[PDB]
Amino acid sequence: VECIKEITESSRNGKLVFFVGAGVSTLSDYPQWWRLVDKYHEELYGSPKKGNYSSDEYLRIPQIFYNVKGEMAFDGILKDFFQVDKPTNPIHDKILAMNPAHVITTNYDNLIDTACWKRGKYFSVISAEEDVANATSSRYLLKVAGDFRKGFKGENVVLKEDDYLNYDQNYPLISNLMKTIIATHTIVFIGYGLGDYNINMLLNWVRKLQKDSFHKPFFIRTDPSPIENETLIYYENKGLRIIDAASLIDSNEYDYLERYSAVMDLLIESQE
Amino acid sequence: NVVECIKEITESSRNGKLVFFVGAGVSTLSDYPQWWRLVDKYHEELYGSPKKGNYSSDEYLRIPQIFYNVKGEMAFDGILKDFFQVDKPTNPIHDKILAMNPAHVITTNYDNLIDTACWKRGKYFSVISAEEDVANATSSRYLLKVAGDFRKGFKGENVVLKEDDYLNYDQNYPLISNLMKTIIATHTIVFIGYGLGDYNINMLLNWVRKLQKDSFHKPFFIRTDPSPIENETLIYYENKGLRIIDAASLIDSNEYDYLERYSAVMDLLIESQ
Amino acid sequence: NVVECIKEITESSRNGKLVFFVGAGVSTLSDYPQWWRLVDKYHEELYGSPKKGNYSSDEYLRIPQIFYNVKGEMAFDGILKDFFQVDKPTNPIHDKILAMNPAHVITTNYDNLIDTACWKRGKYFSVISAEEDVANATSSRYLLKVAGDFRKGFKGENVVLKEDDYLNYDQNYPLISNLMKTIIATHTIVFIGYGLGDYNINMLLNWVRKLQKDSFHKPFFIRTDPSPIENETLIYYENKGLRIIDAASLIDSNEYDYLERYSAVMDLLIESQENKFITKDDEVIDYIYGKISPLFALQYIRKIDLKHVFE
Amino acid sequence: LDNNVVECIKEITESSRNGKLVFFVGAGVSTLSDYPQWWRLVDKYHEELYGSPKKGNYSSDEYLRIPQIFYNVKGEMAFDGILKDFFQVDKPTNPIHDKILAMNPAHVITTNYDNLIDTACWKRGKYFSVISAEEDVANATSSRYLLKVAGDFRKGFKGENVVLKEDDYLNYDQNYPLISNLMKTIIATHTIVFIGYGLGDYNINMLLNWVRKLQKDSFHKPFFIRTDPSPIENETLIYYENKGLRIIDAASLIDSNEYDYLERYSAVMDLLIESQENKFITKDDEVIDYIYGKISPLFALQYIRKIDLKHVFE
């Protein structure tokens, strides 16, 4: 009951920030990225993936589709799948009820963005580098991968593998500013599994932080399998406190929203 | 133009987006021991006699680092207590800066001369000295001591003074490094208390050329040097991102009339608002 | 093409400028226990039994590190001492590698198989496995075991296996990276037994991007996979600095028969060196010329020395 | 030569006969050949920039940053024009260059950007593969390197080819990624004698900042020849010996003029050459040291011919 208290304890002080991931941009029925990787496969090779493709998703096929297939043609398919519109899930309604001071997100839609002005809270979107200094408020929104706000082109969204190495060089301020928000506030994660690109790239950055010098983050597991005794004790050392929805409600193998809205209802009921 | 620089500094003063990157020359006025003095006592207690003329590069930039390894740590902090355990008054400069309503005050100085001046007025800045202070803060308003404070004690582990600590600083203070360059892009920076050719000035311009073409609020340089700035040096440091404001171009003063040149550039900021 | 790659591997073998980069895909033609059989054993002391699921990589990387943290470092050492005290033979690939006459052999392997094949011929190789052996070396031919080796203990500290060992490789082993990278820029590097996605290959291709345009020679990648390569993947990796000789694009074999593909390239290199393809009778008036056109700068050559000219 | 000098030359000469000695030549060896110095171009780039020559008492921050200012303000063709006026000379070879090459080194690394060690090697007739740029490591003609780590002027008297500005020393590990790595292979695998430096030079400090990162005993400590006018201070000798330098002091072997640098270079460099003829066996338990060093390998054999032992004792 300690971890359910401190999240609400930071809510009254207004020192709470959320980290928002792609396990939530499927409950609003926005396209998962491997639908593109499926298309990236069959427009480069010529025939679909009858077998299980391995080391192509975030690895080899979007990168090769940018330069072998064509540069403007990489964004010709991006506008074909991301000039869409999808309805806001209750998770974007349930998170905002906890009054986040900022929201960091690796997602690149306008679906955490269509939930904010449709409530009445003012966040300024810092998604690119000309957005960092040029800001309108101290209550700013941080999209670390980008968004299509400047246009429907490839160089505004981090998708290839020629962008997940020189992200700490081509986007230098956002990468600095994201670390700053972790350093003052308290960070809550959502929609990730243990072992993405960005849960390990941050806890490699956390090893470069000294002892008793940061707030240990909040990572809620919404995978319908239970938590092991082993994998739990491992990620206690890398810095993570785990609140498990799977140890809270018994749900189906595909009842995702029954697990995501479970812990969100566990917070808002514990607000007062 | 000198007017155009003030209209932006006053605009960030009115909008609350003004931060003064505090130098050491604003604390050399208050009779606080300048660091060339400690280099002498580290030189004289180690080589027996002091060196005449000018110091060598391994004897000016490395002679405390030679002193710390050869002599030790109890005798290294034995000298730091002898010069820095004093009581001093604040400048008239320490009255014009806090009255410009700063958001954050970023210092390089290891003394409570810009710090106790805040406690005299109603401005409440939180001293960020150690690495714990970013998460243990109780404010959104920060006194970012990027070099350290003697608040824990008179030990030399708390201030970056040696030669390996201008190199192990990115490994022993990683968030304060991240928190400083946050404020440089968001807030507007004014450099008061340095000279072009200082160490910590040229590290920031290295971080400047890493950034994009128009990604930052290109800061201002308040030159309190006795000489006038040369036109060649003016174009060079400005193209690296430092709008130079010189006291010697505005007023004419003597070769040791420092505090007038320190105050007159701040007289064009208090009277302008 | 295959044919120009055949030449540049041969006439770099005749100059003391050929270095192989030997992987785990030819230690198991000599049938040495693979690493996925270890991580199945580590999965059974921590968990019950491996419900496989085709091994998503987030378990495939962490499971040696988890049993390291929980059980103790003593148990991590004896399991290696269980699975790797096996005393296996040498395949014909090792004999064909050394008959291609290497200056050095770099290897990601923690076995002792290539050193024993190097001891059995008339050439000595200075084994470097640890960090200390760089200065206390012997004779400028190096068997460079960049992943560590069990030549001084079956403890887990000597070899890099975990995930605290991949990201601390530049800290713990600074001199074994510098000597690995010096051989690559100098010599002609051929890879043996990798699969184009590897922590030992993609960490090399990121260092090669940091170099200039023509400041290096492009390494050769002998690829032995059962399904042949596609042209676009051959475009992407030739653009990154790998000249890939594919073994499936020269012979045809079953999807489980490896030694035929590994030898169809190595016989193609050695029998190019040991000259077996000479026809049309104007190919003999430039094999003999290339051995005698140096000797036009001498007025007379002893007839006992012309046997050493023609090898 | 009481204890440290006779133990240092017992290691340098025991690496010279193994082909495992590498000399690291600085600018204070080519300054003896009166080749123009780099103070003479900062003051030149001060007077074409600030109008008048500087007074002196010169700050280091106005030293390193001024030839960049002559580049950023006066352009590029002005920068490499004065290099064609103060470096485009012919100078002769001094006899420390011959005393280096008499030691038969495996490599020679240099921070010099003149071809004076490069004209002292075709004069004596020594074939070094000269690596001055990055495109010369994969095109090495021999196994024996003349590695000019700060560049050279063989492709022309342009500043693209030599490290001189202050934007060059911050892009050294990204514009020269293979010269820097080949140098540290030589420091790891050979015995390094430094000659021509001053214990606070930028190269020697940026090379002892690398050897701290290495393990506690992986490297051998490089040697250092100090030819400074004043005797070395034992606080300075304690500091660099706990950092990766054995310091042979030339001002504690002879005693010559405060402005005659040639005597102190020639002191140690003639002491090393003459010390290959052993002259170390003067104690009766040092005679038995030498003889055990030649014979006790042959205990693996069971009998030796008496005419084979003329080959054992050289």
Side-chain angles (χ1 to χ4, degrees), chain A residues 70 73-74 76-78 81-82:
Chain A
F74 183 79
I77 280 92
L78 289 177
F81 278 165
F82 285 145

Side-chain angles (χ1 to χ4, degrees), chain D residues 185-204 207-208 210-215 218-224:
Chain D
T185 295
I186 299 166
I187 299 170
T189 63
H190 294 88
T191 300
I192 302 296
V193 180
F194 288 98
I195 180 167
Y197 294 104
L199 287 175
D201 188 73
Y202 181 70
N203 302 317
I204 310 299
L207 196 60
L208 293 174
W210 175 64
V211 79
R212 292 177 63 188
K213 293 185 286 185
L214 299 179
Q215 294 298 109
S218 291
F219 66 99
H220 295 290
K221 291 191 285 185
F223 289 94
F224 192 83

Side-chain angles (χ1 to χ4, degrees), chain B residues 46-47 54 57 61 65-66 69-70 163-164 167-168 196-198 202 206 209 230 232-233 235-237 239-240, chain D residues 48 50-51 58 60 68-69 72-73 166 170-171 198-200 212 236 239-240 243:
Chain B
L46 182 63
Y47 289 165
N54 290 318
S57 296
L61 300 176
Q65 180 57 253
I66 295 172
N69 295 319
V70 172
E163 176 64 28
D164 59 353
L167 296 175
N168 297 322
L196 297 178
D198 194 74
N202 294 321
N206 291 322
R209 63 182 293 165
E230 292 85 4
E232 290 83 3
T233 308
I235 300 300
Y236 175 74
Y237 281 88
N239 289 321
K240 294 166 98 288
Chain D
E48 293 291 328
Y50 291 167
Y58 201 67
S60 296
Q68 183 67 42
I69 291 172
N72 281 323
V73 177
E166 65 93 22
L170 278 76
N171 302 324
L199 287 175
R212 292 177 63 188
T236 304
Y239 174 66
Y240 289 95
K243 279 175 90 284

